[PDB]
DNA sequence: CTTCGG
């Protein structure tokens, strides 16, 4: 009697079947099978639409997804002819919930099911995973459901208020709204910024040997040099033109540069954006394909941990392919659960050898591979130099450095300012002085890169949710991406102001981050899901009830006049 | 009309 192994996608089914013997039949569910209604007397109508009942202790009406009836039948029919069912969904909470939905729709004794967990699809990982199969974790499922229901309530109860008060078709979302707020705030900072004039002066000189030495003026009378207009710069240039220049100090020190940690979801998104020009969506879609194909570890992670076997494999690669000088004494540890960073499943698999992956996916694999190999290599070593020069009442500086050992940079694609030899007390001959006018700059616009970064920093959102927050926002008319930077739209500003005014708690960054903590508490049996939802709902209805009132009574302002 | 996840 064979066993039934169920996964989310045909691609994952294919890969996992490579490592499962004849006693297993693998089948995919082709994505989610059940969720809240697709949605296509007033309270009753609302509950019907939501698919959840906040007033009746969160009773839910899960419905099989449009067009999934046939796979459910295929699955039930296959479930019959099996002696055990292994739920092999992805390792995160959403994956736990999908496994749960499968178990619920298929039915049977819970003892007929096992939940297997792995962070990559390789022979050895599948072996370990099936050698020690666990049970469905209901706390993690409930944490998912809690998130799901909260999101649903906000969306379906706040949005209709927006239709009445501002405009039809608008949306609000527990997360989407807070993300928009960040962009709107940045927009207003930029619009309010008043740039200030400041000047710099550089000096080109020659050493006693005749070599060029470029210096920057740093101090005048022992105070930082920063003239604010042309008059002041010219007065300074006048003095600098006549001064005698000499080297006050030469400071030589060895410096190093360290490789970064291996990627996690947020840093991968950032590096793929800045280095490859890939949008967050593209990146996550390709990462998922690489993972389901068995080439990298799971792509939703916030851990920088590396298994002992993974570290062994990469140190072996470094020793064989770069040499002893590139291998640290002991492995580099980057951590702080059984989770791991985003890394190649097999270090001897090169991006060029990837089967059935487009060029851009190979480029992402390369990005991941290089980061993983580099993170276990030695630091690059430099000989840095700082020269301090005196000229009458002025102080000037020049900094340089020469690479002495490439270390981890050897694995990066194949250039430092070098300073001439001079000794303390040497006279320098002035050749030219170049003043330059500059102005202060407003805060930088959010890039798709910096935004993810900001959400992480504030504890808002998670690896499973940093994804495609940046699509509707744009569809929706709230913010738009232009020339690789975000711009708030007026409707974004209009909605944000209204939400901040009447849904202060919901829009508050710290409260939003706290909710992620609350959900983790549920996942870890430190809180109960319906109680957590009860508290959320009590606070939410307080805001909503008030928001619905006339503005004269403190309700949300209409979008008009 | 709408949520987050796809
Ligand atoms: C979809 C989903 C996944 N995850 C991911 C991150 C972790 O790898 C894992 C959660 O582990 P945990 O349930 O023990 O906290 O699932 C969340 O934390 N929250 C979610 O809502």
Which nucleotides of chain B have an atom under 7 angstroms from any protein CB?
1-6
> Is A458 within 8 Å of A86 (Cβ atoms)?
no
Rounded to an integer, what distance in angstroms lies between the CA atom of residue A448 and that of residue A120? Answer: 28
Q: What sign does the dihedral A224-A226-A227-A230 (CA atoms) show?
A: positive
3-state helix/strand/coil string of A94-120: HHHHHHHHHHHHHCCCHHHEEECCCCC
Q: What are phi and psi of A378, to 5 degrees?
A: -75, 160
> Is A309 within 8 Å of A499 (Cβ atoms)?
no
DSSP secondary structure letters along A33-94: -EES-----HHHHHHHHHSEETTTTTEE--EE-TT-HHHHHHHHHHHHT-S-EEE---SSHH
Rounded to an integer, what distance in angstroms lies between the CA atom of residue A256 and that of residue A496? Answer: 45
Task: Enumerate the β-bridge partners of residue A204.
Answer: A214, A432
Identify the CA nearest to A310 among candidates A336, A273, A283, A335.
A335
Rounded to an integer, what distance in angstroms lies between the CA atom of residue A27 and that of residue A86? Answer: 11
Question: Cβ(A515) to ligand 1 under 6 A?
Answer: no
**A468 CA from B6 C1′ (Å):** 9
Task: Enumerate the β-bridge partners of residue A34.
Answer: A64
Structure resolution, Å: 1.9
> Closest protein residue to B3 using CA and C1' atoms?
A155
The angle formed by the CA atoms of residues A7, A8 and A13, to the nearest 5 degrees, is 50
What was the experiment behind these coordinates? X-ray
**A55 CA from B1 C1′ (Å):** 24
Q: What are phi and psi of A503, to 5 degrees?
A: -130, 55
Q: Which residues contact A514 (CB under 8 A, 6 or more apart)?
A: none
| Distance, CA of A195 to chain centre | 31
Q: What is the DSSP letter of A300?
A: S
Core vs surface per residue A237-262: b (16+ CB within 10 A) or e: beebeeeebebeebeeeeeeeebebb
A69 is in an annotated binding site: no
Q: CA end-to-end span of chain A, whole Å?
A: 73
Residue ranges and CATH numbers for the domains of chain A are 1-142 (3.40.50.140), 143-191+443-556 (1.10.460.10), 192-258+379-442 (2.70.20.10), 259-378 (1.10.290.10)
Nearest-10 crossing angle of helices A308-321, A359-375: 90
Rounded to an integer, what distance in angstroms lies between the CA atom of residue A47 and that of residue A106? Answer: 26
């Amino acid at each position: 009697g064979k066993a039934l192994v169920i996964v989310e996608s045909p691609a994952k089914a294919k890969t996992i079947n490579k490592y499962l013997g004849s006693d297993y039949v693998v089948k995919s569910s082709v994505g989610h099978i059940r969720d809240l209604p697709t949605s296509g007397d007033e309270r009753g109508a609302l509950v019907n639409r939501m698919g959840v009942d906040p007033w009746h202790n969160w009773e839910a009406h899960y419905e099989v997804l449009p067009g999934k009836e046939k796979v459910v039948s295929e699955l039930k029919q296959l479930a019959e002819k099996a002696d055990h069912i292994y739920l092999a969904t992805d390792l995160d909470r959403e994956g736990e919930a999908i496994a749960w939905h499968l178990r619920e729709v298929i039915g049977g004794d819970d003892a007929r099911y096992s939940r297997v967990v792995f962070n990559e699809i390789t022979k050895n990982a599948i072996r370990q995973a099936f050698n020690k199969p666990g049970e469905l974790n209901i706390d993690r499922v409930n944490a998912q459901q809690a998130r799901r229901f909260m999101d649903r309530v906000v969306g379906y109860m706040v949005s209709p208020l927006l239709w009445k008060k501002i405009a039809r078709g608008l949306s609000a979302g527990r997360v989407q709204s807070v993300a928009v707020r960040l962009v709107v705030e940045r927009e207003r900072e930029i619009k309010a910024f008043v740039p200030e004039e400041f000047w710099e002066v550089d000096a080109s000189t020659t050493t006693p040997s005749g070599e060029a030495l470029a210096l920057q003026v740093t101090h005048q009378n022992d105070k930082p040099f920063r003239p604010v207009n042309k008059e002041q710069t010219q007065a300074a240039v006048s003095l600098l033109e006549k001064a005698r220049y000499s080297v006050l100090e030469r400071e030589d020190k060895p410096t190093t540069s360290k490789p970064g940690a291996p990627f996690i979801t947020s840093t991968l998104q950032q590096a793929a954006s800045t280095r490859l020009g890939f949008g967050v969506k593209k990146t996550m879609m390709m990462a998922q394909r690489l993972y389901e194909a068995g080439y990298i570890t799971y792509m939703r992670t916030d851990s920088t941990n590396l298994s002992q076997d993974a570290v062994n494999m990469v140190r072996g690669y470094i020793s064989d392919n770069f040499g002893k000088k590139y291998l640290p004494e002991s492995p580099n540890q980057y951590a702080s659960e059984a989770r791991e960073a985003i890394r190649p499943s097999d270090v001897n698999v090169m991006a060029e050898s990837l089967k059935d992956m487009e060029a851009d996916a190979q480029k992402l694999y390369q990005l991941i591979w290089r980061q993983f190999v580099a993170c276990q290599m030695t630091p690059a070593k430099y000989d840095s130099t700082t020269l301090t020069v005196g000229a009458g009442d002025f102080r000037l500086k020049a900094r340089g450095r020469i690479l002495r050992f490439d270390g981890w940079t050897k694995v990066m694609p194949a250039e430092d300012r070098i300073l001439p030899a001079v000794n303390k007390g040497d006279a320098l001959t002035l050749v030219e002085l170049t003043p330059a006018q500059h102005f202060t700059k407003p805060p930088a616009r959010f890039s798709e890169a910096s935004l993810v970064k900001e959400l992480e920093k504030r504890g808002i959102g998670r690896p499973s949710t940093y994804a495609s927050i940046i699509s509707t926002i744009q569809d929706r008319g709230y913010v738009r991406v232009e020339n690789r930077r975000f711009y708030a739209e007026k409707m974004g500003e209009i909605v944000t102001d209204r939400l901040e005014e009447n849904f202060r708690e919901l829009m508050n960054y710290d409260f939003t981050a706290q909710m992620e903590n609350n959900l983790d508490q549920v996942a870890n049996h430190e809180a109960e899901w319906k109680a957590v939802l009860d508290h959320f709902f009590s606070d939410f209805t307080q805001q909503l009830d008030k928001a619905e009132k006339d503005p004269e009574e403190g309700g949300m302002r209409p979008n008009q006049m």
